[PDB]
Amino acid sequence: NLDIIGKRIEKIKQEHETSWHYDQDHPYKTWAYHGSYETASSMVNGVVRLLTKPWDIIPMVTQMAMTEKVDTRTQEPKEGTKKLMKITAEWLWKELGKKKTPRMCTREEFTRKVRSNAALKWKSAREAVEDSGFWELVDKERNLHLEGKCETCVYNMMIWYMWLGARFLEFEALGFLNEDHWFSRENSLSGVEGEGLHKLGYILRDVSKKEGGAMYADDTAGWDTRITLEDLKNEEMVTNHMEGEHKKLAEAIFKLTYQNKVVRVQRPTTVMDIISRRDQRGSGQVVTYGLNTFTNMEAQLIRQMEGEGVFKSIQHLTVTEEIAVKNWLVRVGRERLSRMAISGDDCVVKPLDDRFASALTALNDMGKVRKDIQQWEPSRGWNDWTQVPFCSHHFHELIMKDGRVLVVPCRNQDELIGRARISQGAGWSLRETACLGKSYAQMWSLMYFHRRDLRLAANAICSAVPSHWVPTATHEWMTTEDMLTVWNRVWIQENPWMEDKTPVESWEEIPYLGKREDQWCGSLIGLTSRATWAKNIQTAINQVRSLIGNEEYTDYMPSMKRFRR
Ligand SMILES: Cn1ccnc1-c1noc(C2CCC2)n1
Ligand SMILES: [Zn+2]
Ligand SMILES: [Zn+2]
């Protein structure tokens, strides 16, 4: 406890010895308060907004740009629950480990990443990776970790940001999980890491093909707040697959940063608090993703065990029930993993039958309480894979004019248009604002080509931004290559669900949803505002061209039937 956290605490106290105070009015029950010391608006993208004028009067779009879970306690599962989790976790790390070799990620790898802008004494991250002084601090902390002690690895809430060095040491020990695709669908069977939105629909349709009951897609209420110390201890068992230095380094991340955290929080009453808790999820967002997937795969196999009646009670597991769990895992575990699509805290399960809907004792006792349903009310499943929610999407079946079948991602259009108009920072330039619009426009042309309004707005944005100006899972839209060529590569050539590889010659071969389906999913097709916008699009394109100035532009609008003379 204070032995593992104090040094970190003691060091902060000294940096602010002229402003240290144990406020007796601390607003914390579950977090441990140690002391206190003295101490992000969403901006509108104008290129995108000028080219989506109809949406200026839709509150669901315009409101998106305007403007008690952490402080809670989770009860320790029953002994029978803890046994189910340990046995399942042990077996799950072995399966993930069968065709993967743990390893340490390198200064070299970490450096390169910071130079390509991935979200993770010196101004930026880039400058710190060059200064050998930094690495000397990394070395100091690094050798502290090998002795089982920590000094500078402290979480700052705002999301859990850390100093680049603690990020490096986290990445050094556990980066392999992401960098080497442990949660790929090949190596994990339930995972979808590296798959892409253009593959998730096909993956859900494949789960649909299995004999079984309804498809279940229960969200957890505040997943990262419901991670128990028993969960963090089952995650740590990845170190059993490790050796030498790596093993020691990983053990220290788990022991000193995950299973015993130190955090600094801003409280307007503006002081900085220094609270400590052993539970809940607090890692980098990328290690969080992988350990979430891991623990969710474990929770969902156990819920599947409960509905198949492998065990009778969570209160206590008989000796023979343990043998039966172990034998279920060996006999059918891989088959049961294949019945699920899991992305962090998000899941879809097609169980053997609908007893799963009412198998709630283990799930609730593990603390993974379902969102927006009474603790003991049975799950409502989906009968059609095209109605199931997953990663903020649903998936349509869309037949091309030549019989070939696309499975395409979709969500409420007002959400898509709302996101494209929003970013962060007051520092950016017009060329950079224009670059993001193209990044959104190119994503829309690759993922949402089947929505009439987004294909039109994507064509307008690409016509309004200089042709050679580059745009900012997989991200095939981040390129200067012609979008019709990328579409053919992603939806035809590299698509394992498409047998006939005949390239599409033009955008007009590429179909839309039915007009009524497009309206159901939020299209303004049929409105008077939308007809005026489409008819007069060249004038909106010219408004943006005049603002950016005398640059080299392309007209992409004749790629659509209605503008092609
Ligand atoms: C390039 N980039 C990455 C993240 N955000 C941006 C960005 N660029 O321009 C803008 C302005 C604020 C609204 C439009 N944001
Ligand atoms: Zn440390
Ligand atoms: Zn839809």
UniProtKB/TrEMBL annotation:
Binding site for Zn(2+) 1: 141, 145, 150, 153
Subcellular location: Host endoplasmic reticulum membrane; Host mitochondrion; Host nucleus; Secreted
Domain of life assignment: Viruses
Record: residues binding CTP: 222-224, 292, 371
Residues noted as binding Zn(2+) 2 in the record, renumbered to the chain: 394, 396, 410, 521
Binding residue positions for Mg(2+) 1: 219-220, 345
Residues that bind Mg(2+) 2: 219, 346
Domain RdRp catalytic: 213-359
Function comment: Regulates the ATPase activity of the NS3 helicase activity. NS4A allows NS3 helicase to conserve energy during unwinding. Plays a role in the inhibition of the host innate immune response. Interacts with host MAVS and thereby prevents the interaction between RIGI and MAVS. In turn, IFN-beta production is impaired. Interacts with host AUP1 which mediates induction of lipophagy in host cells and facilitates production of virus progeny particles.
Assembly mode: Homodimer; in the endoplasmic reticulum and Golgi. Interacts with protein prM. Interacts with non-structural protein 1. Interacts (via N-terminus) with serine protease NS3.
Protein name, entry field: Genome polyprotein
Organism the protein comes from: Dengue virus type 2 (DENV-2)
Span within the parent record: 2764 to 3382 of 3391
